[PDB]
Amino acid sequence: VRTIKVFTTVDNINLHTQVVDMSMTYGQQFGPTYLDGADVTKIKPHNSHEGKTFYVLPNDDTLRVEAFEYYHTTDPSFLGRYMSALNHTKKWKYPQVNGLTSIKWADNNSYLATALLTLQQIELKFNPPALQDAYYRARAGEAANFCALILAYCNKTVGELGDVRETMSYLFQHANLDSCKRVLNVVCDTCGQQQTTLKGVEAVMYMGTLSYEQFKKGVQIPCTCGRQATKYLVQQESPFVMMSAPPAQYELKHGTFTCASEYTGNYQCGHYKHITSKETLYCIDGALLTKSSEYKGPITDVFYKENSYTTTIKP
Ligand SMILES: [Cl-]
Ligand SMILES: [Cl-]
Ligand code: NA
Ligand code: NA
Ligand code: NA
Ligand SMILES: [Zn+2]
């Protein structure tokens, strides 16, 4: 009966000694098993595996606690989805473009590239240690684990089409936004005024206009009575805001925004690019970079800096 020693893990930090029988597969001994992303479930131990670390599913109470503390999920398939994505993302390339970690286009990943570029330009801290650790590496240029985690947390597989606004929502759900507050007022000439207070992720996201200045002036929305109501920003406390809308031709003016996402094509199929406002307007499309003094395109999301805002509007 021949054996080697290997280590299992769910978090790649806490290791669990195992003595494995070389006549059985990893799967017969551990359940689904992965070696830096590669599925070894149906493989029998090799001598070269001695001393190496394998990921497994959180198959006992110790691992369940370790996995929840590191990832902040109890979705049973999470670890397998992360590993499956990592086996791909470890082969992607992450060029530094204008000082930021981007992603060379592969596997329909333009939505991930513009999300990653965006994160590097807004003040945001993640809650799960897994995203903390992986995001630090991604800033340094080694973004594979971070991208595989985005995919897993968003329930997206490599190659699946994704929406930037939705992806950001998931990332924000795993971020500490508890200092963010938004007060809105909605005014119907028939139905009167309704103030609402939004906290956390809802305090920093709005769907319906790209213009923060228009959101402060008031945007027209439906009311139940059939009139239009006017929605405006009363008060904002956050380090950024994200304004989104269905893609439409829109002019991005240098110095008036932080960065934006552009979507060319239609709902079936298109492509994202990233625009960042620095000393000029830079358009980052994966590995590609172009510049211009002005920019007009089908924009979907625009990010703005903020600290504290209070309206002058008297009601
Ligand atoms: Cl972080
Ligand atoms: Cl979280
Ligand atoms: Na896979
Ligand atoms: Na950031
Ligand atoms: Na949160
Ligand atoms: Zn009304």
Side-chain angles (χ1 to χ4, degrees), residues 3-252 254-267 269-313 315:
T3 64
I4 58 160
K5 178 189 74 184
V6 304
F7 301 101
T8 53
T9 194
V10 292
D11 63 17
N12 207 33
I13 298 165
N14 277 20
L15 306 179
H16 300 281
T17 309
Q18 309 292 342
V19 174
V20 294
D21 179 333
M22 299 188 85
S23 69
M24 298 164 75
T25 62
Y26 284 108
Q28 297 173 284
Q29 299 179 85
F30 300 154
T33 305
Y34 303 86
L35 178 62
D36 193 38
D39 189 343
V40 295
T41 302
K42 300 180 174 190
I43 280 179
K44 298 181 197 304
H46 297 165
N47 285 295
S48 77
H49 292 163
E50 188 130 55
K52 297 191 165 152
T53 295
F54 294 79
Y55 280 81
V56 298
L57 304 189
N59 56 50
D60 67 44
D61 291 353
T62 297
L63 298 177
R64 271 191 272 266
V65 172
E66 291 171 358
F68 182 73
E69 295 293 311
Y70 200 61
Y71 303 105
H72 294 180
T73 176
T74 54
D75 186 32
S77 62
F78 184 86
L79 261 305
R81 296 179 296 94
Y82 170 43
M83 286 297 102
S84 173
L86 178 64
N87 207 47
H88 296 269
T89 62
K90 76 186 178 176
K91 301 183 292 249
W92 289 355
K93 300 307 181 188
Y94 302 99
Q96 292 295 306
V97 184
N98 196 46
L100 299 174
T101 307
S102 189
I103 318 174
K104 175 186 173 220
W105 186 89
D107 296 306
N108 301 322
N109 67 4
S110 71
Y111 79 105
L112 293 166
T114 186
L116 170 59
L117 289 162
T118 294
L119 289 168
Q120 292 170 84
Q121 300 174 70
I122 61 172
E123 190 183 311
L124 186 84
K125 292 216 157 324
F126 288 109
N127 287 326
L131 285 176
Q132 294 171 0
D133 292 348
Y135 182 55
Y136 182 87
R137 294 184 67 185
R139 288 170 62 238
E142 287 75 42
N145 282 273
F146 189 67
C147 293
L149 288 167
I150 296 174
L151 286 163
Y153 279 116
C154 295
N155 275 88
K156 287 294 181 279
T157 54
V158 170
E160 199 169 351
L161 294 179
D163 176 266
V164 168
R165 189 222 76 91
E166 187 81 355
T167 302
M168 295 311 290
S169 188
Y170 275 94
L171 293 171
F172 293 168
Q173 285 171 335
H174 289 93
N176 176 6
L177 295 171
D178 289 342
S179 291
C180 296
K181 173 168 90 151
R182 161 164 292 168
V183 179
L184 300 176
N185 194 24
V186 176
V187 177
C188 180
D189 301 327
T190 284
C191 310
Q193 321 199 349
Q194 192 49 62
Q195 180 182 287
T196 63
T197 299
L198 301 174
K199 289 191 202 247
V201 47
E202 279 94 2
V204 300
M205 288 186 92
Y206 182 72
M207 167 55 60
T209 180
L210 301 176
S211 176
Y212 195 33
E213 286 314 295
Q214 197 52 61
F215 197 51
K216 291 170 183 185
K217 285 177 91 220
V219 295
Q220 304 296 111
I221 67 177
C223 189
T224 39
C225 77
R227 297 180 62 84
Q228 302 189 312
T230 301
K231 173 174 270 180
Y232 63 95
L233 183 60
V234 176
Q235 220 269 305
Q236 184 71 31
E237 298 284 332
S238 63
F240 67 89
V241 299
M242 181 185 179
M243 306 295 300
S244 297
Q249 290 301 302
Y250 184 85
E251 176 164 12
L252 288 172
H254 172 238
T256 72
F257 67 109
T258 299
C259 65
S261 288
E262 177 187 81
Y263 190 77
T264 74
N266 71 10
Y267 78 120
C269 74
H271 185 88
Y272 279 101
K273 302 183 188 175
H274 181 88
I275 297 97
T276 178
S277 178
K278 308 295 286 186
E279 61 276 17
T280 191
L281 298 177
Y282 293 115
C283 181
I284 301 171
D285 183 9
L288 305 181
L289 172 68
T290 60
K291 72 179 192 172
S292 56
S293 52
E294 286 107 357
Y295 200 92
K296 187 173 154 96
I299 304 307
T300 56
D301 311 284
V302 184
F303 293 81
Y304 302 83
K305 283 270 153 292
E306 185 53 271
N307 37 58
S308 178
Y309 169 81
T310 309
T311 192
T312 77
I313 289 172

